[PDB]
């Protein structure tokens, strides 16, 4: 039945976009539109989209009728000789799979996982020490490699902060979904009564993008002045254009200098600063420009879990989907294909 689910996960994309090609392949049959150098290119983009929307809905209704015809669950000749006929016609059903996993604006490069603990304290930290090994095996089964950027313990038990980098083809796209705060319910070891306790810890996921460290502010947008020195001096403080002022226009920053008694030792020493302040205000951006690319979910408070893990009754409660697996202990081994299978839907299903 594992293809009545997937087979129809692309049976909904039919009508929504179907009648849309009508109001597009109808703007092609008329040249009067072409006059627009771009509104005639944009349309030829939508016109060419009937490529991945006219081959699938076609060779998928074949993988639904060329199988549900000669398939006896009883070993036969004209039957088990039809399975290998749909083994690569089901394995290729993966073409539509990676289409909802490789369509991320930045899912190529390696991902970075920051598993930080939260509510639950002494225990909540233990939670992250599990969710870590949980994501360690996962990425170590699918082939990907790992790089423990950082990892530090603490007081009683668990882990304080654990950051790691994992590679391997199409990686971020697989861990992007598992992003948020995970909850846990089990008998707190670090308790006397052994009461049932909860724990919160977050899992962040951001891909390794920009790397280099460069800023070549070519003296192409600078306005350098040279007024007369100020303060003391002598028969020359009044005569020499010592003081210099370099101006940055796309920013509005201005740096001055009268420290010495030479314009050339001051315009370069006054530049030796603009380089500074800029690298700081040109970086202050990299702090705000990357703090909204990650997302927002991360309070770790009671009432904001993406997935709830429980060892008590023993089951996993994916709150995002509505699904409620029964194998918690099994998941903590890396088995995550399925929650991400649903995670790469709920998430990339609204955009």
């Amino acid at each position: 039945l594992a293809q009545r689910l997937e087979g129809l996960r692309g049976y909904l994309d039919i009508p929504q976009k179907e009648t849309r090609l009508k109001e597009l392949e109808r703007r092609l049959e008329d040249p009067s539109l072409w006059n627009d150098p771009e509104a005639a290119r944009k349309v030829s983009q939508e016109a060419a989209r009937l490529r991945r929307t006219v081959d699938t809905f076609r060779s998928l209704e074949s993988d639904l009728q060329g199988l549900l015809e000669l398939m006896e669950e009883l070993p036969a000749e004209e039957r088990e000789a039809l399975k290998p006929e749909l083994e690569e016609a089901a394995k290729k059903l993966d073409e539509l799979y990676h289409q909802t996993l490789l369509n991320f604006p930045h899912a190529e490069k390696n991902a970075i996982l920051t598993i930080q603990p939260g509510a639950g304290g002494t225990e909540a930290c233990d939670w992250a020490e599990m969710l870590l090994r949980m994501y360690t095996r996962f990425a170590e089964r699918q082939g990907f490699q790992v790089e423990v950027v950082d990892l530090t313990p603490g007081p009683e038990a668990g882990i304080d902060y654990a950051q790691i980098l994992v590679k391997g083809e199409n990686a971020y796209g697989l861990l992007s979904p598992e992003a948020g705060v995970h909850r846990l319910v089990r008998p707190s070891p670090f308790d006397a009564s052994g009461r049932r306790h909860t724990s919160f810890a977050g899992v962040e996921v951001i891909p390794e993008v920009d790397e280099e460290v460069e800023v070549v502010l070519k003296p192409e947008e600078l306005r350098i002045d040279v007024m007369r020195a100020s303060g003391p001096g002598g028969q020359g403080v009044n005569t020499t254009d010592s003081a210099v002022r370099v101006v940055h226009l796309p920013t509005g920053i201005t740096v001055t200098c009268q420290t010495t008694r030479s314009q050339i030792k001051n315009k370069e020493l006054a530049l030796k600063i603009l380089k500074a302040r800029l690298y700081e205000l040109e970086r202050k951006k990299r702090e705000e420009e990357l703090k909204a690319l990650r997302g927002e979910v991360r309070p770790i408070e009671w009432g904001s879990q993406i997935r709830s893990y429980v060892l008590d009754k023993n089951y996993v409660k994916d709150h995002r989907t509505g699904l409620m697996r029964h194998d918690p202990e099994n998941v903590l081994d890396g088995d995550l294909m399925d929650l991400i299978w649903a995670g790469l839907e709920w998430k990339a299903g609204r955009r």
């Binding site: 090609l21 597009l24 392949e25 092609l28 049959e29 008329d30 040249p31 072409w34 060419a48 009937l50």
Partner: protein
């Protein structure tokens, strides 16, 4: 190739053709219809077989046209002899195909019409040139 002042030459598909993807609407900008070249068109493609059918069009401004069918482009007919699907991103000395001596005379029973020469050998040495276009080898 036919007449001008209202014409278009394309190399239609084979089997099915009505939508807009291949060229369905392109012939409509210069004057065309949807009910004249879809079913009342594949009468020839149902005969030419499959693959490609270098049949073209000629407009009159009243749903009329000179659907003069043609023989598959020497670019395609060569992929059959050798086997490859494309030919080569770049021709030269390397190509994912092969074509023996009389391999070029297998098409000699195909291309005989509008090449210019009625015979098979004075018209085959033309396709030996498409073997220096896509790349396709010439076993010998």
């Amino acid at each position: 190739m036919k007449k001008v002042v209202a014409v278009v030459k394309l190399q239609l598909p084979a089997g099915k053709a009505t939508p807009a993807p291949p060229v369905g609407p392109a012939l409509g900008q210069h004057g065309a219809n949807i009910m004249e070249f879809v079913k009342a068109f594949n009468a020839a493609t149902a005969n030419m077989g499959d693959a490609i059918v270098p049949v073209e069009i000629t407009i009159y401004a009243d749903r009329s046209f000179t659907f003069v069918t043609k023989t598959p482009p020497a670019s395609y007919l060569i992929r059959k002899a050798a086997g490859l699907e494309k030919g080569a991103h770049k021709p030269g000395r390397e190509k994912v195909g092969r074509i023996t001596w009389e391999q070029v005379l297998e098409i000699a029973k195909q291309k005989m019409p509008d090449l210019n020469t009625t015979d098979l050998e004075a018209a085959a040495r033309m396709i030996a040139g498409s073997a220096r276009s896509m790349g396709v080898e010439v076993v010998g």
